[PDB]
């Protein structure tokens, strides 16, 4: 009865987008039950997702949608909700936990096996956000979520990153219609559009030791420099990188 | 089955760990895979030795400080005394005749390794050599092959016509050519931009005795992949957070 998680990624076409979906490829392949959401934002899924997925034998779903002329990846997160919605019913019996996880963040191992018993939605630590070392829940000794430790709109009703919380797919399908708002929304508020909609404060379930331990990190890779390319291009272009 | 001896210079800074973390979970489905990590530091720091320790991989952990006056300037490539301590203590370790099976491959902890890369150069001979990406301000730099399956030159813009025009992370070596030209080490100080690979794989072998792997150099299986500095101004002069939690 071990719960599926299932990962949901959104891409995006650019250079070092093979490394990225490569180097989590390679933790997400020791992740037993897993199912990799992968939402291309691109007219079309691209073949070098789609051979990357196919080669990998991970049990994947690779869909798409293109993000018109609000933060990177909403559309398809939102896509990939109603995916799930669409695929599983309401009061379906097949445990699920979903997690929102970009294609650049890194992850530990011991951060899905945590995430994996979320009855309704767990929250921890992530490195490298909200400009600082690490922004994590507050919990009281009882080990209930009272509060936000960071220097950003401590006060938001969810004050996490993405990276930061997983939700059990129950409450997922039961609340149809919550999704990430892309509208009149305030920087770093996003979360809070959808959780809110989804659990309160008091429900979040603490992991990582309490919220003491860091077992993901919020990871940016340089823009690699091209230069040497030129105008005309010197390497060849359909070699896949 | 050789075993591939992945040597890992690395240095405390906050995105070590998930460095690190990203770089293990990588090299645990590689089968034979003994990781050298060298650490620059006077001794063994508490959070890599931990991080080695419940990977479960098979690995060595070592360390050798850069003198603080050679990280400045009013040159020296970072990592080099500690590749150079990984070579020397393989051949402290193996006997120049050991004849054991075996690879060296010099790998940072922030490029980005496919798995098929290391069936690659498990096999390797003498010197094997293969594309890698984001390098020499290009897409990617490649060995160039002739009819006759020999390096013949190589595809970069920046100098394309030095000994080896290669990144550390584009080639491995037979440990038995390691351990036979003892003397082979990186060039330490003065080293030309570009120019370290160079200065140890023109005293181990010559062109016409590279290996060329990766279906021929037309494959990309490893990414010269950078890490951005994280922003920590929110930490302020006092810091914010616990410095005694491990990030």
Redesign the interface.
Known sequence: ALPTIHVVTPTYSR??Q???L??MA??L??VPNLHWLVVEDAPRRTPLTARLLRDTGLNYTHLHVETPRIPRGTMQRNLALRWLRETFPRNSSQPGVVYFADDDN????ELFEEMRSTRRVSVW?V??V?????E?PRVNGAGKVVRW?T??DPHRPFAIDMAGFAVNLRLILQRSQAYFKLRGVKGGYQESSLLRELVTLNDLEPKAANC???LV??????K??????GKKG??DPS???
Do not use: C, D, M, Q
């Open positions: 250079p070092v093979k490394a990225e490569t180097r390679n933790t392949l020791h890194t992850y530990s191992l630590p490195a490298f909200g400009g600082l070392r690490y994590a430790k220097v950003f003491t331990k860091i990190w919020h990871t940016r890779t340089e690699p420099v091209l230069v040497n390319e010197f390497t070699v896949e990188i």
